[PDB]
């Protein structure tokens, strides 16, 4: 209802850096809110693309931001009659960023890795890696759970089981309230996809520079499968956490598998041991059902509801014609030992090729009426195709079909305005939660403030 579209703030990164590809609010020990922005095509210090991360302090006038510094030097280690190698060129540092407590986790899903042993190798592949930073102390740590030291031939002899070479760890990411980092790795197990989880504290305490292959004893990875429904499913393209089984002592995970079962797509709700609690199947092949997932209670009953996005959904129209517009599916959580059912609401985009449901952000209670609200992005929506973000307010009955407010892109064509989104944090301390929108195509982030 009330985000100010006139009084925006713009934060800018370097040309061609994709500043705004990912973002999050980060709060320091004192309590001051800043904005973490990922910029996965930022040039490194040797003019080669490595990606980068920026920490922006809140200013009404916005502007440039300091670079949260990370080690962009490749590493080599000759140990145990092998040669371990990291490759940070084109790694896409900041393709995902997430904040937890006083920690920032920025990931490079296309960081490559190889192990040489005489004339053999593991193969130079994108295992992915996450860089962890603690701004107020300077501490750095890394996490790269898919790195192995198994040679190519052995995978072949074992029919490519437990093949983590193409994980792209940190493609998606989320952190629980307790401090468990959960990474989506959609290239895991020969492109089925997997999840890796580990406590943030343990990542820091087990990491030393130059080791490259090390143990995080408390880590837990998901499982490989011979079920063809999972092949090429990109399970972990998106990830999120919530409470979906009544037991508050446990945390449930929501995983996006947008090409699951021959491109039908799926989202799964899992316990923290990775046992399936529920599966939500996509509606239409190639719709990318599971591109986005969002967890928030919108109907005010204290039970987390689930939102799933299928940005390439094609709507039926006059004379048997289909029209790619995108769709978002709302699933309200019922009471008792009852699973998620059919959707309570379908929100369909209106602009052709708009990719409505490309991103879904919980906003918190934007107008303080009691019900939490969400924002949905159509990165190429609006009459002009410049991009659009639509606010839907919560009510007793779920969400409204009619958006309360539409935010048109202030940037030019190709900005991908809305491709990334974050809310539910009051950046200016006025008592109302605000919204940050990324437009990686324009190398900028826009901050919208909520008002009485």
């Amino acid at each position, epitope marked *: 209802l009330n985000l100010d579209p006139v009084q925006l703030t713009f934060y800018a990164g370097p040309n061609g850096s994709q500043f705004g590809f990912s973002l999050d609010f980060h709060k320091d020990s004192h309590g001051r809110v800043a904005i973490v922005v990922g910029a996965p095509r930022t040039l490194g210090p040797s003019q080669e693309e490595t990606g980068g991360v920026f920490l922006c302090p809140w200013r009404a006038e916005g502007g440039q931001c300091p670079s949260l510094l990370f080690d962009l030097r490749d590493e080599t280690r000759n*140990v*145990g*009659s092998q040669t371990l190698q990291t490759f940070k060129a084109r790694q896409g540092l900041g393709a995902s960023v997430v904040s937890w407590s006083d920690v920032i986790v920025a990931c490079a899903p296309w960081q490559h890795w190889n192990v040489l042993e005489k004339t053999e190798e593991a193969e130079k592949t994108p295992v992915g890696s996450c860089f962890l930073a603690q701004p107020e102390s300077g501490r750095r740590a890394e996490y790269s759970p898919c790195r192995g*030291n198994t040679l190519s031939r052995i995978y072949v002899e074992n029919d490519f089981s437990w093949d983590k070479r193409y994980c792209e760890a940190g493609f998606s990411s989320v952190v629980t309230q307790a401090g468990e980092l959960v990474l989506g790795a959609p290239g895991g197990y020969y492109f089925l996809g997997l999840l890796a989880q580990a406590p943030v504290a343990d990542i820091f305490s*087990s*990491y*030393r520079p*130059g*080791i490259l292959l090390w*143990h995080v004893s408390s880590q837990s990875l998901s499982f490989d499968s011979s079920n063809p429904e999972y092949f090429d499913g990109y399970w972990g393209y998106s990830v999120a956490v919530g409470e979906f089984d009544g037991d508050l002592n446990t945390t449930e995970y929501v995983v996006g598998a947008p090409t699951w079962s021959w491109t039908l797509g799926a989202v799964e709700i899992l316990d923290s041991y990775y046992q399936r609690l529920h599966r939500l199947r996509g509606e239409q092949m190639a719709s990318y059902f599971g591109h986005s997932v969002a967890v928030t209670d919108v109907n005010g009953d204290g039970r987390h509801d689930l939102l799933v996005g299928a940005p390439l959904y094609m709507e039926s129209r006059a004379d048997r014609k289909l029209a790619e517009v995108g769709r978002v599916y709302l699933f309200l959580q019922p009471r008792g030992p009852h699973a998620l059912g059919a959707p309570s609401l379908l929100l369909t985009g209106t602009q052709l090729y708009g990719r409505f449901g490309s991103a879904i952000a919980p906003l918190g209670d934007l107008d303080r009426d009691g019900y939490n609200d969400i924002a949905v992005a159509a990165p190429y929506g609006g009459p002009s195709g410049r991009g659009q973000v639509l606010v839907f307010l919560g009510q007793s009955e779920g969400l409204r079909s009619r958006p309360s407010q539409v935010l048109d892109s202030p940037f030019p064509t190709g900005s991908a305005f809305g491709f990334s989104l974050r809310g539910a944090v009051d950046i200016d301390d006025n008592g109302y939660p605000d919204l940050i929108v990324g437009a990686y195509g324009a190398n900028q982030v826009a901050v919208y403030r909520a008002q009485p």
Partner: antibody
């Protein structure tokens, strides 16, 4: 608390075999490489080999190829070392070892199993 | 195989001394070295991994240094419990190989 609990002292006859065990306590044996090391008063420490219990794959110093067979069982969380054709040179103390963090390191050690070959 | 030559084989030192044990590899092992302690009649405890990193719980008075083929373990301000045997191990190549050991002994 990580702790490797080795089996008790062995008194065995030359030409026979013996099988020592190392049971993981406070962790799972499949978590890391497990190594076996021989110690003798005069000749010092010798590395025998290692196993990756996750998959069973092994490596050995050529000196012990054919005498030593390392195995592991993730059901019982135990690693094993078997020595065939016992000689007087096999009279030694044997340790199982594993790393703390570094895949390749040798940081945590069992209490040692003593083997005496005698007629 | 890589030959790890450890020196000295023994030293007679006193409480509060700072002492160093050195270890020379037969080739470069680029910090792929561990230091181990064995107290009288006891088993082993890991002190250092990858050249300089203290194993969890190990006192700060132990420290590792060196590079290439030459490394040192330094104990600062010897405690009574530090009178033990110490060994280096390399894991740059298989087979892993150990130094011959250094024994700390009480001077009198």
């Amino acid at each position: 608390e990580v702790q490797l609990q080795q089996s008790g002292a062995e008194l065995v006859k030359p030409g026979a075999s013996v099988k020592l065990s190392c049971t993981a306590s406070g962790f799972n044996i499949k978590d890391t490489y497990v190594h076996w090391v021989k110690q003798r008063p005069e000749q010092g420490l010798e590395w025998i080999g290692r196993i990756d219990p996750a998959n069973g794959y092994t490596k050995y110093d050529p000196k012990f190829q054919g005498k030593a067979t390392i195995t592991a069982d993730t059901s019982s969380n135990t690693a094993y070392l078997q020595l065939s054709s016992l000689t007087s040179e096999d009279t030694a103390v044997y340790y199982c070892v594993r790393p703390l963090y570094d895949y390749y390191a040798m940081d945590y050690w069992g209490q040692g199993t003593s083997v005496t070959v005698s007629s | 195989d890589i030959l790890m030559t450890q020196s000295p084989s023994s030293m007679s030192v006193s409480l509060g001394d700072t002492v160093s044990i050195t270890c020379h590899a037969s080739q470069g092992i680029s910090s792929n070295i561990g230091w181990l302690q064995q107290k009288p009649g006891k088993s082993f405890m890991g002190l250092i991994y990858y050249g300089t990193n203290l194993v969890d719980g190990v006192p700060s008075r132990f420290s590792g240094s060196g590079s290439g083929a030459d490394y040192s373990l330094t104990i600062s301000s010897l405690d009574s419990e530090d009178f033990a045997d110490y060994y280096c191990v390399q894991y740059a190549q298989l087979p892993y190989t150990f130094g011959g050991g250094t024994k700390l002994e009480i001077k009198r």
